[model samples]
Structure formats: C-alpha cells, structure tokens
Target: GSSGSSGQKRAWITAPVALREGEDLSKKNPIAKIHSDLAEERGLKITYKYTGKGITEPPFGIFVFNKDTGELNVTSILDREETPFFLLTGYALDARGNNVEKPLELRIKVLDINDNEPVFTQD
Candidate 1:
C-alpha cells in the first residue's frame, strides 16, 4: 500500500539510520545526538531543534529529541515504501539560545523488509 506522495530535497551531508521497516520501536533506538564536547566542558546545556518531516508531519511522535541527553530517538514504526528516508535539519544550541554548531542534516533511512518474495519468471 504505497502512498502516492512524491517530492525530495537535497542536503550536503547526512548520518545514515538503520532499522527494519514496520518493526516495533524500542528504547535501544538512539538514532543520533546533538552534542558538543566543548559545550559540556563549559557546563553549557545544549538543546536541539528539528525541521522537517518526522518532526512535524503525519505519524507524529516518531522523532523525539531528548534535551537532557542530547539524543534523538524514533518512537514509531517506519515504513520504507511510504517514505524511504526522512530529511531533517538539526540545530545545536546552548542555554542562552546561542548556536553552538552549524546546523546539520540527519537522513533517517528505513531498512527494507523481505515482504516481497523474489520471482523467477524463466525456469
């Protein structure tokens, strides 16, 4: 049941995400982190912002950013065919609302499942 939605965006770099499509969400799903060693040394708290699909679109509550741990977690089951990958812009900011690092792109990829069987037309 592939939905008929089509569009794409380009970004400079991306951190790959791996997980089988339609699988159950688990606490072990720590996709990425918005962290800075320098900020930690300075005792500055780092917060993160996400701009794109998973963050504010249908199937809400999939992408979650933990400010305290500076970690990004996916709490919902993802379908590869429906939306192969999620493009998100991540911002790392400090307690004073200052940017600690340049914004980055996170490409959360959905691993395909063996739902379709291979067919041998010619025997």
Candidate 2:
C-alpha cells in the first residue's frame, strides 16, 4: 500500500488453514501501509484481480479476518493453469482527502499444490 500520510503502514491477513512461512504471521499477511513521515489518517481498501485471459471470475475468493489482530487473509487456492497471479493494489488517503498520486501495488504469486487426488466420472 502507498503512503497517504506520513505514519507507518499497518496491515493483517486471515486464512482457513494454518499459515506457514513466517514467525510473525502478520508480516506474511496482507497489510495497509504508508511511509512514516506523511501525517495522514486514512483507511485502506483492498482489491483482488486474477491475471489471465478470457477468465472473468475466480473459482473462489474470500477475505478472512483475524479476531486477535484484525488482519485480513484470502483463503483460496488459485489455479495456476487458469490464473497465475493475484494483484493487490492499495490507495492511501489523509484527513483532507484521498491520495491518488502515490498508489501502492502488491503482487501475490499463487503456488501449485499436489496434495489432493483427482477422480474421473462418466455420464
């Protein structure tokens, strides 16, 4: 996320399964951030988009919130074959108004998993 104000950017995430890959889960989770120099009091708005051709909707997209830290996380396995990347773009705002000048861009790479079995059926 970009800095609307001069304060430090803060964010969080939530998921169905246990989060892996970091000590502070909040660090790995999604966040709303800004440079700790601009004096602005603003909230964050997050958007999700699939990176692919001819695909309008994703198989699943859900935002989860952590009760303890108030973090938000997306709980869905993105299909790499159809969609490879999830784009997370953020905008900052101050008490006066929204800051469209310096918008922050975040890119999330979806990894492929092989922990499930497939079955075929005949009609």
Candidate 3:
C-alpha cells in the first residue's frame, strides 16, 4: 500500500561536483535555473544556496540555485548511488513577483559503479 501527501517536498540527491560544501556552484553552469516550487516546498527561504556535502559524498548530484539569478544547476558527473534517482522539482516566479504553479523537474540519474561497498546490519 502506498500513501502520502500531494504537496510534500521530495529530497534530491546529486552527483559529486568538483566543488566541496559551502562552495559556489555559480561558476559551474552560467545560466541554469530551477523551478521556484522546489525551494518553497523544501522550506528553503533563500533563493540561492549550496547543497551540503555527505559522508560518502555518495557520488551523487545535488540540487542548487544561483543567488544572483534564481537559476537551477545540475551536476553532470557520475556517482555510486542507486538508480531511479530522486530529482529536485520547483518553479520560478514571474515578473509580477508571484510564483508560477507549474513545477520543473530536474532529474539526476545515478550511474553504476563497482566501487560500491554495501554494509549489512542486523537489529
């Protein structure tokens, strides 16, 4: 059985960028923009912010936006995470200072890798 809320915000794991956490993603892609709904849904008040780095770095892509210009950027690198990757979705506001309802989906598919080391645990 599957059940969940319609407007719930989804988590997106991104591929590894050359830059580390707290690093600026602006230089990677000059003119990439993400949907506004993603930020609002995730409760990210700021228009522009960097996704933090993980312990494994997961070899995944992260969702981010440009501060100067509300643009979304996706990483092109490959990571060791599982498939059917979770992508970030959002919308951009119009010139009227209002957010458009339509959401843009940013899919960051994860590639397979032999380096993956699975850890098994029992409760």
Candidate 4:
C-alpha cells in the first residue's frame, strides 16, 4: 500500500514540502546538529563551522553554527547530480581555542527530482 508519488520524504520528524526551483530552503529544518562534550567547568566554549577542506575538498557543507549555541543552519540547496550528498567533518573547539580534531563525519542524502532535465543537447 504505497503511493506512486515515487518516494516519500517524511522519514524524519522534519516537515516535507515540494519546493520549486530557485526557491529558498529557509523553511527546511536544520540538516545537522552537534553536541559538544567538552568540560564547561573552565568556561569552555565550542565553536562550529565548515573547515576549508571540510567544505572545499569534496564540498553545502554550507553549515553555519553558533559559538554560544550549537545550532547549525543548512545554508544551501540540493543538487544531487552536481552534489548528490555532502561528506565532510564537523569540528568543535576546546577551552583554549585548540582544535579538538574530532573525527566527525557528516552525511546527508538528497531527494531525486526532475527540476533540471538530465538530457543534454549535442553541439
């Protein structure tokens, strides 16, 4: 008893919507969330952001995080053909501005659509 809608995007608690191209995903939920386990006894703070290679290497890694709060914002759109999914490390800092060097591998999947046709014309 499945709908012929092809696929369902309601796997998570996030809302699902069919957005037109050039539309903003600002209505979407935060793609990722990070929790820092650092000791806060020393007035420690955790910072989050997409590292150089973390975004450029295989780059949306378009994640903007808060220093005071660990809330991350998904700042990019989805284009499976160009970037089916994004794989990059998420990092957090320690008390003394030292690199935690955490091995945080993040993976996000994208839904398929015909927004841009796959067919290309030959010159």
Question: How many Å off is the CA of 59 in candidate 1?
Answer: 2.8
lDDT of 3 by residue, 66-91 (tens): 56666656444334343235444444
lDDT values for all models: 0.69, 0.39, 0.42, 0.52
Q: C-alpha displacement of 80 in model 4, angstroms?
A: 1.0
Q: For model 2, how does the per-residue alpha-carbon lDDT over 57-122 read when each residue is reduced to its tens digit?
A: 345443343323434455543455666555544343344455644554545454446434365533
Mark the regions of model 3 whose C-alpha exceeds 4 Å error after superposition.
1-61, 74-78, 82-84, 95-97, 113-123
Model 4, runs deviating above 4 Å? 1-23, 39-43, 52-54, 57-61, 99-101, 114-123
Better of 1 and 3 by lDDT: 1
What tens-digit string does per-residue lDDT give for candidate 4 at 27-120?
Answer: 6555455546444544556666555333556453554666666665556665656665555456666656666665465555555665543655
Evaluate model 4: give its TM-score: 0.53
**Candidates sorted by TM-score, descending order?**
1, 4, 2, 3
Check candidate 1 and list the clashing pairs. none
- The better-scoring model by TM-score among 1 and 3 is 1
Model 3 residue 89 lDDT score: 48
**In angstroms, how far off is 101's CA in candidate 3?**
4.8
